[PDB]
Structure 1
Amino acid sequence: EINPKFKDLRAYYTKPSLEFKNEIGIILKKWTTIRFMNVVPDYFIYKIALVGKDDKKYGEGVHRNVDVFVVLEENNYNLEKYSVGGITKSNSKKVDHKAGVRITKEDNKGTISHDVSEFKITKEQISLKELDFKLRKQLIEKNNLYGNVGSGKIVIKMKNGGKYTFELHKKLQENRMADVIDGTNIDNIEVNIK
């Protein structure tokens, strides 16, 4: 029912997450190996690692109209509240979009399940981090991802034919946690677990 071969992935993708909307980001002078966006939604300062394309995108100073999708992590910088990527532009208008999910699953025994789902997007711009994190956590919850089976792929398919693939046998590559896409152009989501 739960295989220890996948324990790290199942623990990573069942971690709680936090969403910060219509917020402000402060980036200061580089002090270590990378640069951080500081966000202060409550009594804490959160350090959001500027990885991948976020490094060039954000100069030092103040950035308004910022959403962040947060998954707090251990780290080697001695930081209490740290997460990687998931910074996006705050909605410029109402967003309430759902995309169809089709899920196919094959265990080691040959049993082939077929689920469907609907995925609610409430952001005009959304990080792959958020999509990857929320879709995996769901698959674990409802389809036993990282229980009996722990590989395969998620494919996000777009109105224009483009796509974004998450391979299920490892974490999303950290650089990709900074990648962002138009939520309301997500057409459907194809999950294949094998």
Structure 2
Amino acid sequence: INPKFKDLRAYYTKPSLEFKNEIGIILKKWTTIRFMNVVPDYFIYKIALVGKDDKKYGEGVHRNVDVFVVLEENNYNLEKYSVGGITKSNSKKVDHKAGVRITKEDNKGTISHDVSEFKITKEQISLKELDFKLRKQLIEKNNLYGNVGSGKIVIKMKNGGKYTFELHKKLQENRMADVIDGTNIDNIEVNIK
């Protein structure tokens, strides 16, 4: 485990929480960004509204919301804070899978291959969740951010289109708020260099 990747490895090995079929509460702005409050247990989670989420959710109550949460440190003196990951709750049952192909190349030049399948149980999924779950898998199973920490994850959609997450840096915050049709994910290709 190499220190120039220690930040990336620490972030992508955090615990995540998934809150489904919840209610979101947006209070009046009190700092430079707005938050959606979610209360699934005895804690109040503040979810930053970044990217498209700002114009998407007005002040007030928002029902049928699902959130993929990763507690992070912040400059707003908030205890339970997470960015993006908000999706609309399911309209119906979803039971879809996407095949994952991994190729890894060492600093030695050693090349490995691996495969898995990524289960999808949500009609609408955030890039935050795809990005986060996959990297965590890559770290735990393929030693991502140990020996090497660059490359890409590419989610391919059934219609043709692609979303690519560059491994050398965290997923951009504005992108943690983008959302896609889970049912339209075809397969996932990962190249670790």
TM-score range, shorter chain: over 0.9
Within 5 Å, which residues of 2 pair with 1:2-17? Answer: 2-17=1-16
CA apart distance, 1:90: 0.4
Separation (CA, whole Å) in 1 of partners of 2:86 and 2:134: 18
Structure 1 alignment gaps of length 5 or more:
none
CA apart distance, 1:177: 0.3
CA apart distance, 1:144: 0.3
Separation (CA, whole Å) in 2 of partners of 1:154 and 1:109: 22
> Could you tell me which residue of structure 2 aligns to residue 181 of structure 1?
180
Separation (CA, whole Å) in 2 of partners of 1:113 and 1:184: 29
Q: Percent identity?
A: 100
TM-score normalised according to structure 1 size: 0.99
Any idea what the Cα deviations from partners look like across 1:121-177, whole Å, max 9, x if unmatched?
110000000000000000000000000110000000000101100000000000000
TM-score normalised according to structure 2 size: 0.99
Separation (CA, whole Å) in 1 of partners of 2:163 and 2:33: 26
- Which SS does the other structure have where 1:102 is aligned? strand
CA apart distance, 1:61: 0.8
- Which SS does the other structure have where 1:155 is aligned? strand
CA apart distance, 1:26: 0.5
> Could you tell me which residue of structure 2 aligns to residue 161 of structure 1?
160
CA apart distance, 1:62: 0.6
> Could you tell me which residue of structure 1 aligns to residue 118 of structure 2?
119
> Could you tell me which residue of structure 1 aligns to residue 133 of structure 2?
134
Separation (CA, whole Å) in 1 of partners of 2:100 and 2:126: 18
Separation (CA, whole Å) in 2 of partners of 1:138 and 1:117: 10
Separation (CA, whole Å) in 2 of partners of 1:38 and 1:110: 47
CA apart distance, 1:28: 1.1
Separation (CA, whole Å) in 1 of partners of 2:19 and 2:87: 10
Would you say how many aligned residue pairs link Structure 1 and Structure 2? 193
Within 5 Å, which residues of 2 pair with 1:33-182? Answer: 33-182=32-181
Separation (CA, whole Å) in 1 of partners of 2:151 and 2:74: 28
RMSD: 0.4
- Which SS does the other structure have where 2:31 is aligned? coil
Structure 2 alignment gaps of length 5 or more:
none
